[PDB]
Design a protein around this ligand. Structure first.
Ligand SMILES: Nc1ncnc2c1ncn2[C@@H]1O[C@H](COP(=O)(O)OP(=O)(O)O)[C@@H](O)[C@H]1O
Ligand SMILES: Nc1ncnc2c1ncn2[C@@H]1O[C@H](COP(=O)(O)OP(=O)(O)O)[C@@H](O)[C@H]1O
Ligand SMILES: Nc1ncnc2c1ncn2[C@@H]1O[C@H](COP(=O)(O)OP(=O)(O)O)[C@@H](O)[C@H]1O
Ligand SMILES: Nc1ncnc2c1ncn2[C@@H]1O[C@H](COP(=O)(O)OP(=O)(O)O)[C@@H](O)[C@H]1O
Ligand SMILES: [Zn+2]
Lengths: 45, 434, 443, 434, 437
C-alpha cells in the first residue's frame, strides 16, 4: 500500500525565496533553488 | 592569416541589398550598380516575402546573359535577413536515381517552409566532483562544481542505476534533465583527465561550465518541415535525414503533416515563417515538372518561387516545340516576369571600381579605360578575371600599383571564346570530331 | 491565420434548388453549363448508383475548371473523400504507374467503423492478494482473487481480478502510485508511468512522472474511426507488429512502395463485403481528380480502360488544358485534346470557354475583396483593359504589388498611377516573348 | 440501402453468354444480345474449357470498337462458374520495374491454372467446463461439456502453451484440432458467462454445441502454381504473396514444382483444373513478349488463353514495320481469329431496353426512337451514359416515365467527342501545342 | 491424365540404324535432309569429345524447327540435360544480360555425384550439455536408444545449437549427419502418445536398424546450382545463414574466380573418379531477338573450350540487327556469329505431306475423322496454312459431340471454318474497314 505523502514541501534556504528545493549544498548543508540565494546562504554561513 | 571555409567568390563581394523608405534603388549600394526597375521590383516582392500573407506565387526574371540575375537574387536573399528558410537548387539537382523527380520537387517545396516554436525546459549541466552510493533501496549523492557554485544532488535507486549502467565516474562533465530523466555525458575535465597516462578510443575535453548549474528557461526552437516527414515516415528519421536515403514518400503522411501543423496553427502555439525557393537555368526542365508546378502553385501552402531563365527561346527536352523561355505557355502566365537591361560602359567603370576594393589592389584611372574596353567588347567576367590575374603579374614586377602593360600581358596570355573559336577554325581539321 | 490560396475563394458550386446555376454564387461567375453539368456530377456522387464513371474537362487555360473540380469537394463536404492527383505523380522510379493508379483508386474509397472502448485508469492506492480460506491436503494455500485499487479525481474504485493477471503484475515493474493502462476487452496491462504526486520527494529520478488521469475510473466511450481502403491495403501489405526479427530488421530498412498483388485486393473486398453485410462499418465512395491528363503515357491511357471497366473504380475527373497534340510515347500519333480516341470515347467531355472582359472585371473584384484590397473605378477599368489585352491571370497578379506599394505610399486604395507604375515595371508573358525575338541572336 | 463493394458497371450486368445445351447462340439471354457468330464461338471455347482435355491453345477476338469484344469475355467469365479459375490481365500490368516482363508472363500462365486440394480433419468442438494447469513441465486437464456428452481430456506441454498463448479460460466454447494442433475460440456461453469476475469484459457469446464432441470435417481449398512457387521459393515467404516483393524466381525451382505437382496428380491427392487468361488490347504489347509467348505456349502446363485486338494493320512497338493487328505473323497465324460483326439498328433498341430492367428505370416508348437514333449516330456507350444521366435528370423532375426533354437536357449538358473536336478547332489556336 | 501438348506427339527424329531418314517415323514426316543432318549431331553430343559447337536451324515459321530441337531432346534421353531458352528471357532487371548467357552454360552442363554419408538416427533418451569455464558449453552428451541397442555419443556446441534451434527435447526421434553438420527432427515416438488424449505433435513409429549407417547417395546436380550454392551462403548452420535464409533470394552475378575454383574442385572430383560429368545441350529459340551485345559475348562464349553444344533457331530472313539501327543482317544474326554457327536448311511441307500431319495430329487428339473431312482439311490447309487445319480439329470434334455424331463431317468442318477466320481473309477485311479502325 502507498505510504502517507509528506504534507510540507521542501523550501529554499533564504526564507523570502522559498520554493521546492532544486539542489542541496554540502558546504552550507542547506538546499537552494538558485545561485542568487546561494550567494546569500554562503555569505551567511 | 587564418583562412576560413569561406573564400572570395563571384557573388561573395556583395553583402546586403541597399534600399530606402521609398524603395528607390541607389546608384551604388552594397556593391550593386544598375537595374533600377529590377531592384525596385525586387524590393516589392521582398516586402511581399516579409509579409507572407499569400502563398503559391512564382516570379520569373528575364534578360540577356550577364545582366546579374543571380546578383539581384542573392541581393534579395541577403536583404531578406537571416533565419529565413531559403532553398536555391539547380535544375539538374532534382534528377536522382534513387528518388523520383516528383519527390525531389515536392521535398524542395516542403523544406522551404519553416515553423518557429517556443518550449520551456530545465537542464542541469556541470562537472562532477564526486559520486557516492550506499546499498543496504540504495541511496547516493553526487557532488557537482561550476564556476559560480558547487552543490550536491541526492538521487534515487533507479537514478543510480542509470549512472552505474553508463559507468559514470567522478570528474566528468555531464548534463542531467529532471523532467525527462536522461543523462548526457559531455566529456571529462582537463585536470582530471590529465592524470591518465593514455586516453581511450572515445574521449573529449570540455571546459568547466560557467553560470547557473540548474537553468530553467524558455527557448524558441526553429524547425523545418522537411525534417518531420522522415521522422514520421520511419522509426529513425535523423539517420535517413543526414544520410539522404529516404525516397518515394507517401502523400498521405504529408497530408497528415499538413493537418497536424494546421492544428498547431489553430492552437496558436507555433507560427509558420514563409520561405524562398530559387531555381536557376529553368530553361532546361522536364515537361512533367512543368505540369507539376501547376498544382505546386495551386496548393494551399507553398514557398515563394524565384526562377531565372537565361535563354529566350529553346526547345524543351523530351518534345519538339518552340516556346518562350523554354517553358510552356500554360505555365508561362503563372510567372511574374521582371526584365533587365545590360550594363552601360559608364557603369562598368563603377562596378570595376567596386571590384577593386575586393582585392584591395589599387588601379590607375587610365587602366579602367582598357579594362572597361575589354569588359565592353567582351564578357565582363573575363575582365573581372583580368584584374585579379593582372595583380599577380604586378607583384611579379614588384610594383606598388598595376599598369596597362599588366592588362595587355594577361590579355596576351588568355584569349576570348571567340578568339579560341577563330584558332579552332584554323586547326579544326586537326581536332577530332570537327 | 490561414495563408490565402489562389483557389481559396471558391467555396463550392452554389447551386439553386431547381438545379439551375446562379450567375454569381460561392465566388463563381459565368460557366453556367459547366456548373450545371458538375451539378449533375455531384448528384451522381451522392447517388452512388454507378461506378467507374470518367468525366473530362476541356477548355482554354484559365477558364476555372480546376476551381470547379475543387468546388465539387467543397459542395460535397468532408464526408466523402477527395483525392486530387496530377499526372506528373504517375511517373515514379520505385513504384510502377499501374500500381500508382491502383493505389489512387484505393485512396479514393474509404470506410468508417464505430467501436466502443472500456478503459480503467488512475493512481493505485492499494494492491491486495485476497485469500479465500479453502485448505486442502493436496495443495496448502489458495488465492481466490487479487484486488486492485484505483484512485481518480472524480472517484475511487476497487476491482476484483483473477490471480492470473498478478503473474504479469509481478512480471513487470509495478509500484505504489503507478498510473497504468488496463483495458477490459483486451485484458492486457500496460504501465504508463509514475504519478506526478510523488515527484517532490526526490530531486533527481530516472522515472518520468505522468499526471493522474482526470475522469471516471471506468471509461466506456464509442468513437468512429475512418480508415481508407488504401490504408487497409498498406496495413495488410506490411506487418505492423515488430515482435519478429524480420519485422524489426525490415522496420529498420528504408520503406519503399511495393507492388500489391490482386489477391490482397480481393481479400479486402471480401472482408469489406462481410462487414457491410453486418452493417457495423459504413462505406462511402471517393472522388478522384486528375490534372494535366495529357501528360500520361499511352500505357497508362490503355490501362485506364481495364481500370475503368471494373466495378470497384471510383468516379474519376480529368482536366486537360491542351488541344490536339501528339500522344506521349508515340511520335507520329496525334489525337484531339491529347488523349487517345479509345479513352476519349469513354470519358464524358465538358467544354469550357474564356471569360468576357466584364466577367474579368468581376473576377478581379472578387479576388480584390478576397485579398482585402480596395480598387478605384478608373484603375479597375484600366486593369480590365490590361487583362483583356493579355490575360485574366496577369491582371489578377497585378493586384498585390499595387496594394503593397499603395500602402507604402500611404494611400489605402489602389490608383491608376499605382497600377501604371506596376504595369510599367513588370512585363507580361506575351510582351516579354516579343522582346526575346529582337535579342534572340544575343541569347 | 446497403451498398456492397460492387456497383453497377458497363460489363457487370452480364450474367453469362446466354447459350443453350446445343451451344447454338440465343438472341437474348443472360444479359447478352446479338452477335450470334461470336456468341457461338464463345460457346465453343467455353465447352472446350469445360472439357479441359487439351492444353496450350490461343483464341483471338477482333472487330470494330463498340462491338462488345469485352462483353463477350465477361460473358464467358461469368458463365464459366465460381469453381473454375479465371484471370483477367492487361498488357500494361505485366510491365513492371521490379520484375521482367517475361517473368510476369510466367506468373500469368502459372497463375491461370488452378489446383484443387481436399482436406479431411477431425476437430473437437464444445463448451469448456474447467481448465487446470500444474507448473513445477506443466501438466493440466481440460473438462468440456456438450448437450450430447460431457468429456474430460488431458493437456500436454505444447497444448498448454497453445491455450495459454490463446488466453483460454473456463467458460469459453473453443475448437481444438488434434492433428494440426490449432485452437480457435468461437465465443462464450450465456449461462456459464452470466456470472463473471468483477472485471466485466463484454465481447461475444456463443450457444453450447450439440452432438458428438469430436467430428470429422472436409475443407476444400485451391492453390495457384505461382503461389506455391513463391512460398517454396522464398523459404517461408507467406508474407511475400500479399507483399509482392518477390521477383525473378529461379527456373529450377519452377521445374521442381511442376514435377512435384505432376507427382501429386499421379497420387490423386490433388487435382489440376484449367483456367482462362484474358488479355485486352494486346496490340501494344512488345514483340519480345510475343516471341516468348509463342514458344512458352508449347508447354504442357500452359493454359488456353484469349486475347483481344481493337485495331488492325499497325506497326508493333519496337519495330518500324507494320503487321496486321499489331501482332507478328508467327503468333497471328499461331492463333485463331474470331471477327465480331458490328451491331445493327434492331439490336440497339434491345440493348437500350436491357438497361430498363437492370437499372430499374421506366422508359417511355417514344424515348426509344430518339435514343435509338442517338445510338445510330453516336456510340452505344454514349447512349448508355445518356440513359444514366437522363434518369438522373428524370429524378430531378420527379417523373416516373422518361421524357424527351430530359434527354435533350443531358444532350445539351454533355457533348460528343466529335463536337468537342469541332470547338477544339475553333479555339485550337489558343490551345497549347496545337 | 496428362494434358495434350503440341510437341507431345513427337517421340524423336525417327532415324534408322544407317542414319537415313524414314518417310514417317517417331511422329515426324518430311525434312529428310534435316533429320539426317541431325543424325550426325546426336552422334557428336553422344561422342562428347568436341565442345564449342553451334548449329543454327534456318526455316520458315511452322516448319518444325522447334519440333526438331525437342526431337533431339527426346533422342538424347533423360540423362542428357537439355536447357531451352528464349531470346526475351536474357533481359532481367536484377542481373546483366551477359550473366544470363554465362549461367546458361553451367545450367546446361550436368554433373552426377556419388556421396557417402554416415547417418546417426534414433530415439534420444538423454541430452545434457557439459559446463566449462570461460559459463560456456564445451561439449555435449547425448544418448541414443534404438530397438537394436543404446549408444551414448558426444556432440559439438554447433550441433547443440542446431538441436536447440529445432527445439529438440528428451523423448524425440532426430536425424543427425556428420559431414554436412545439419540436424533434422523426425518427431516424437509413438510410444508416448497414450499419456495425453490430446496433443499437437504428431507421432511417428520408432525406426529400425543400426544407429550408425554408411550409405551411398547418387545425386544429379547442375553446375549452375553448384555455382549459386557457392555464390550465396543460403544453406548452412550459421545464424547469418539463417538470416540470409530469411532474406529475399535476388539474383547476383558470379565472379570468374569462383567459376575457376569450381572448375578446380570439379576437376579434382573427376581425378578422384567419384563424380561423373556429362555434357549438356543449350537451345536458343527466337535468336533474332537477342542483342548485338549478346552476340558479341557469344563470340567468346562459343569459342570457349568448356562451352556445351548450342543449337539456335531462326524463323526469319534478312532483318535489321537489334541495336544497330542501320546494318541489316541475314537471319537477324550478324556475319561474325553467322560465320561461326553451322546452318541447316529447312524446306516447306508439300501438299501431300501436310495431310499426313493432319491425320497424325487428329489421331493424337483422340478424334475420329472421315477420309472426306481429311481431304477437305488437307485442301484448305494447302490453301492457307497447316496451323489452321491443326487448330480446326478440336472444335469440329466438339460439334460432333454436340450433334451426337461419332465422327467429324463436312458440315462440321464447314461450320468451324465458317466461324473462324484465316489470317489472309481477316487481313483483307481490315483494308475496307481500316478507316474505322
Ligand atoms: N548590378 C551588379 N552589381 C555588381 N555586380 C554585378 C551586378 N550584376 C552582376 N554582377 C556580377 O556579375 C557576375 C556574373 O553574373 P551572372 O551570374 O553572369 O549574371 P546572370 O546570371 O544574369 O547571367 C556576378 O558574379 C556578379 O557579382
Ligand atoms: N469563374 C471564376 N470566378 C472566379 N475566379 C476564377 C474563375 N475561373 C477561374 N478563376 C481563378 O483563376 C485561377 C486559375 O484558374 P485555372 O486553374 O487556370 O483554370 P483552368 O484550370 O480552367 O485553366 C484560379 O485560382 C481561380 O481562382
Ligand atoms: N452483346 C451485348 N449485349 C449487351 N450489351 C452490349 C453487347 N455488346 C456491347 N454492349 C454494350 O456496348 C457498350 C460498349 O461496348 P465496348 O466495350 O465499346 O465494346 P468493344 O469492347 O467491342 O469495343 C458496353 O457498355 C456494353 O454494355
Ligand atoms: N515433320 C513433321 N512431322 C510432324 N509434325 C510436325 C512436323 N513439322 C512440324 N510439325 C508440327 O507442327 C507444329 C508447328 O511447328 P512449329 O513449331 O511452328 O515449327 P517452327 O518451329 O519451324 O516454326 C509443331 O507442333 C509440330 O508438332
Ligand atoms: Zn532560492
Amino acid at each position: 500500500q502507498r505510504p502517507s505523502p509528506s504534507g510540507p514541501p521542501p523550501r529554499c534556504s533564504v526564507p523570502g525565496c522559498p520554493h521546492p528545493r532544486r539542489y542541496a549544498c554540502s558546504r552550507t548543508g542547506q538546499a537552494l533553488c538558485s545561485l542568487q540565494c546561494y550567494r546569500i546562504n554562503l555569505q551567511m554561513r | 592569416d587564418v583562412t576560413r571555409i569561406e573564400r572570395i567568390g563571384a557573388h561573395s563581394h556583395i553583402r546586403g541589398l541597399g534600399l530606402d523608405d521609398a524603395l528607390e534603388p541607389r546608384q551604388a549600394s552594397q556593391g550593386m550598380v544598375g537595374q533600377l526597375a529590377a531592384r525596385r521590383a525586387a524590393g516589392v516582392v521582398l516586402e511581399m516575402i516579409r509579409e507572407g500573407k499569400i502563398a503559391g506565387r512564382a516570379v520569373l526574371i528575364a534578360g540577356q546573359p550577364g545582366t546579374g540575375k543571380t546578383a539581384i537574387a542573392m541581393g534579395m536573399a541577403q536583404a531578406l535577413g537571416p533565419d529565413t528558410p531559403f532553398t536555391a537548387i539547380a535544375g539538374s539537382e532534382i534528377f536522382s536515381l534513387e528518388m523520383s523527380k516528383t519527390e525531389a520537387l515536392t521535398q524542395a517545396f516542403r523544406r522551404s517552409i519553416g515553423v518557429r516554436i517556443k518550449e520551456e525546459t530545465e537542464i542541469i549541466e556541470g562537472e562532477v566532483v564526486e559520486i557516492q552510493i550506499d546499498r543496504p533501496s540504495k541511496v547516493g549523492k553526487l557532488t557537482l562544481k561550476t564556476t559560480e557554485m558547487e552543490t550536491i544532488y541526492d538521487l534515487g535507486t533507479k537514478m543510480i542505476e542509470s549512472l552505474t549502467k553508463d559507468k559514470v565516474q567522478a570528474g566528468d562533465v555531464i548534463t542531467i534533465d529532471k523532467a525527462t530523466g536522461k543523462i548526457s555525458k559531455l566529456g571529462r575535465s582537463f585536470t582530471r583527465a590529465r592524470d591518465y597516462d593514455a586516453m581511450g578510443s572515445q574521449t573529449k575535453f570540455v571546459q568547466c561550465p560557467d553560470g547557473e548549474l540548474q537553468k530553467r528557461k524558455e527557448v524558441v526552437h526553429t524547425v523545418s518541415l522537411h525534417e518531420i516527414d522522415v521522422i514520421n515516415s520511419r522509426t529513425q528519421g535523423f539517420l535517413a535525414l543526414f544520410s539522404g536515403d529516404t525516397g518515394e514518400i507517401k502523400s498521405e503522411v504529408r497530408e497528415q503533416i499538413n493537418a497536424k501543423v494546421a492544428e498547431w496553427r489553430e492552437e496558436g502555439k507555433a507560427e509558420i515563417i514563409p520561405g524562398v525557393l530559387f531555381i536557376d537555368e529553368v530553361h532546361m526542365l522536364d515537361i512533367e515538372s512543368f505540369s507539376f508546378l501547376n498544382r505546386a502553385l495551386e496548393s494551399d501552402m507553398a514557398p515563394v518561387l524565384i526562377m531565372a531563365t537565361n535563354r529566350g527561346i529553346t526547345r524543351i527536352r523530351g518534345t519538339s516545340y518552340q516556346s518562350p523561355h523554354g517553358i510552356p505557355i500554360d505555365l508561362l502566365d503563372r510567372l511574374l516576369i521582371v526584365s533587365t537591361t545590360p550594363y552601360s560602359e559608364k557603369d562598368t567603370k563603377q562596378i570595376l571600381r567596386i571590384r577593386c576594393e575586393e582585392e584591395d589592389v589599387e588601379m590607375s584611372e587610365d587602366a579602367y579605360t582598357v579594362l572597361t574596353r575589354i569588359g565592353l567588347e567582351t564578357s565582363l567576367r573575363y575582365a573581372i578575371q583580368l584584374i585579379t590575374a593582372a595583380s599577380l603579374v604586378c607583384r611579379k614586377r614588384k610594383g606598388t600599383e598595376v599598369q596597362v602593360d599588366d592588362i595587355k600581358r594577361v590579355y596576351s596570355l588568355f584569349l576570348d571564346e571567340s578568339r579560341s573559336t577563330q584558332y579552332m577554325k584554323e586547326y579544326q581539321d586537326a581536332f577530332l570530331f570537327n | 491565420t490561414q495563408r490565402i490560396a489562389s483557389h481559396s475563394h471558391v467555396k463550392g458550386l452554389g447551386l439553386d434548388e431547381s438545379g439551375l446555376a446562379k450567375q454569381a454564387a460561392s465566388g463563381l461567375v459565368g460557366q453556367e453549363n459547366a456548373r450545371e453539368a458538375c451539378g449533375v456530377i455531384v448528384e451522381l456522387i451522392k447517388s452512388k448508383k454507378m461506378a467507374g464513371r470518367a468525366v473530362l474537362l476541356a477548355g482554354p487555360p484559365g477558364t476555372g475548371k480546376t476551381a470547379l473540380a475543387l468546388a465539387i469537394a467543397q459542395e460535397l463536404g468532408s464526408k466523402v473523400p477527395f483525392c486530387p492527383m496530377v499526372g506528373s505523380e504517375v511517373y515514379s522510379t520505385e513504384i510502377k504507374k499501374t500500381e500508382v493508379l491502383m493505389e489512387n483508386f484505393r485512396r479514393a474509397i474509404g470506410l468508417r467503423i464505430k467501436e466502443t472502448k472500456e478503459v480503467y485508469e488512475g493512481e493505485v492506492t492499494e494492491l491486495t492478494p485476497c485469500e479465500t480460506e479453502n485448505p486442502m491436503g493436496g495443495y496448502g494455500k489458495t488465492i481466490s482473487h487479487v484486488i486492485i485499487g484505483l484512485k481518480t479525481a472524480k472517484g475511487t474504485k476497487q476491482l476484483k481480478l483473477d490471480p492470473s493477471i498478478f503473474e504479469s503484475l509481478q512480471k513487470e515493474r509495478v509500484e505504489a502510485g503507478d498510473v497504468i493502462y488496463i483495458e477490459a476487452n483486451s485484458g492486457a496491462v500496460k504501465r504508463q508511468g509514475r504519478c506526478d504526486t510523488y515527484a517532490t520527494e526526490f530531486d533527481l529520478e530516472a522515472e518520468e512522472y505522468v499526471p493522474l488521469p482526470k475522469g471516471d475510473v471506468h471509461k466506456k466511450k464509442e468513437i468512429i474511426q475512418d480508415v481508407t481502403l488504401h490504408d487497409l491495403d498498406v496495413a495488410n501489405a506490411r506487418p505492423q507488429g515488430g515482435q519478429d526479427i524480420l519485422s524489426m530488421m525490415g522496420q529498420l530498412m528504408k520503406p519503399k512502395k511495393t507492388e500489391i498483388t490482386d489477391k490482397l485486393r480481393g481479400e479486402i473486398n471480401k472482408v469489406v463485403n462481410k462487414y457491410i453485410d453486418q452493417g457495423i462499418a459504413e462505406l462511402v465512395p471517393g472522388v478522384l481528380f486528375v490534372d494535366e491528363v495529357h501528360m500520361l503515357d499511352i500505357e497508362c491511357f490503355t490501362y485506364l480502360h481495364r481500370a475503368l471497366e471494373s466495378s470497384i473504380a471510383p468516379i474519376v475527373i480529368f482536366a486537360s488544358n491542351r488541344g490536339n497534340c501528339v500522344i506521349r510515347g508515340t511520335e507520329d500519333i496525334t489525337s484531339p485534346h491529347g488523349i487517345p480516341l479509345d479513352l476519349l470515347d469513354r470519358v464524358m467531355i465538358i467544354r469550357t470557354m474564356l471569360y468576357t472582359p466584364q466577367e474579368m472585371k468581376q473576377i478581379i473584384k472578387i479576388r480584390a475583396q478576397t485579398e482585402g484590397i480596395n480598387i478605384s473605378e478608373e484603375a479597375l477599368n484600366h486593369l480590365g483593359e490590361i487583362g483583356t489585352k493579355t490575360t485574366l491571370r496577369y491582371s489578377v497578379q497585378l493586384l498585390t504589388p499595387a496594394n503593397l506599394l499603395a500602402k507604402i505610399n500611404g494611400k489605402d486604395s489602389i490608383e491608376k498611377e499605382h497600377v501604371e507604375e506596376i504595369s510599367e515595371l513588370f512585363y507580361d508573358a506575351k510582351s516579354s516573348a516579343k522582346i526575346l525575338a529582337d535579342q534572340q541572336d544575343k541569347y
